[PDB]
Structure 1
């Protein structure tokens, strides 16, 4: 056990404290001075690509899920939305409970559909973080519901005080989800796919998708076309700081070189 820390401003700096450790000059005149806020793991420098992010989550039985509310959040660049089944067709994730909606500000929504063994009743965050929904934070992942990874803080505010929204969905297929041998594919259309790499940024995927549509490199067949990208092409530090490609074909695999 431990006491839940509380943020307070003293000597022009934020400090951790608690209601029992304040001096008489600190003043709390209404419950409106207290706030709960959610901060995104994005802002701490974590890798946000789909292969790296999914390795932070895992399945576990025997632990009941828990939910806590928060009042304000941060605009997210990367969010995630999962539709995972077992190879026998059964769902791996539970439907979203009544009143739990997706995170409300996501520049990119990485939507992953696929299969895995799912050896556990619920999927938790392996580092103890939370999955942030619409002003509710949960310890587990809900099916088909957009979330951002984050953590919660509690504040006392001082007495005094001193563009639109665009969202783009990026779809993926996955096999062996949640294991050591997971493979990912970025979806151009229902029959044209790109083998995914950890180094691919969102805008690289969107522009690679554009060149495929405008160069006419989609599948013209009943069958599935999968493009591979050689190491020596360039791909677009943290998020806050073309004609040149050539396509050759070898299901059906192929390679895109510079």
Structure 2
């Protein structure tokens, strides 16, 4: 239990690891099967410090047959994911859709320094999860040089 010591609150970091590193299907067709729309669930957000370089990113726009986009309006703090190898530009349709888009696996829609329960409109993301770990000032400096 006494193993390890935490000096400053800046040293505790939350690293987001993409599902791409978990060797899951990166194709947008199979990736679109991992999300679904549901009403009656509030969207929650958690900020993290570091993240992985994503292999595939998605900029989706699911719209009503009338043209109404069903994705939520992104708050100001939400921004595109920093590093993506390829960004899939997708435009979908769903007439029966209700509520908001959630992840069926329980993973998070990773945005820049933010993990979200919901996929926001017009913002690049990647599927992933975050992990809590401690790295002191000297160790963190060595990895990033």
TM-score clears 0.5:
yes
1:95 to 58, 70, 73: 73
Please state whether the residue corresponding to 2:49 is helix, strand or coil.
coil
Larger radius of gyration: 1
1:36 to 4, 7, 14: 14
Distance change in 2, residues 1:57/1:49 (3 Å): same
TM-score (norm 2): 0.89
Distance change in 2, residues 1:88/1:77 (3 Å): same
Q: How many aligned residue pairs are there?
A: 140
1:115 to 77, 93, 116: 93
1:67 to 45, 58, 61: 45
Distance (Å, rounded) in 2 between the aligned partners of 1:26 and 1:45: 31
Please state whether the residue corresponding to 2:10 is helix, strand or coil.
helix
Please state whether the residue corresponding to 1:31 is helix, strand or coil.
coil
Please state whether the residue corresponding to 1:43 is helix, strand or coil.
coil
Please state whether the residue corresponding to 1:144 is helix, strand or coil.
coil
Please state whether the residue corresponding to 1:37 is helix, strand or coil.
strand
After TM superposition, the structure 1 = structure 2 runs for residues 139-158 of structure 1, keeping only pairs within 5 Å, are: 139-157=117-135
TM-superposed deviation, 1:95:
2.0
Distance (Å, rounded) in 2 between the aligned partners of 1:113 and 1:37: 30
Distance (Å, rounded) in 2 between the aligned partners of 1:29 and 1:71: 17
TM-score (norm 1): 0.52
After TM superposition, the runs of 4+ consecutive aligned structure 1 residues lying more than 6 A away are none
TM-superposed deviation, 1:27:
2.0
Gapped runs of 5+ residues in structure 1?
A: 1-21, 163-258
Distance (Å, rounded) in 2 between the aligned partners of 1:132 and 1:145: 10
Distance (Å, rounded) in 2 between the aligned partners of 1:159 and 1:104: 23
TM-superposed deviation, 1:26:
2.8
Distance change in 2, residues 1:78/1:118 (3 Å): farther
TM-superposed deviation, 1:50:
1.1
> Does structure 2 retain, via aligned residues, the 8 Å contact 1:102–1:134?
yes
After TM superposition, the structure 1 = structure 2 runs for residues 157-168 of structure 1, keeping only pairs within 5 Å, are: 157=135, 161=139
Alignment pair present for 1:54 and 2:54: no
**1:83 aligned residue:** 61
Distance change in 2, residues 1:101/1:160 (3 Å): closer
Distance (Å, rounded) in 2 between the aligned partners of 1:80 and 1:108: 8
Distance (Å, rounded) in 1 between the aligned partners of 2:42 and 2:62: 20
Gapped runs of 5+ residues in structure 2?
A: none
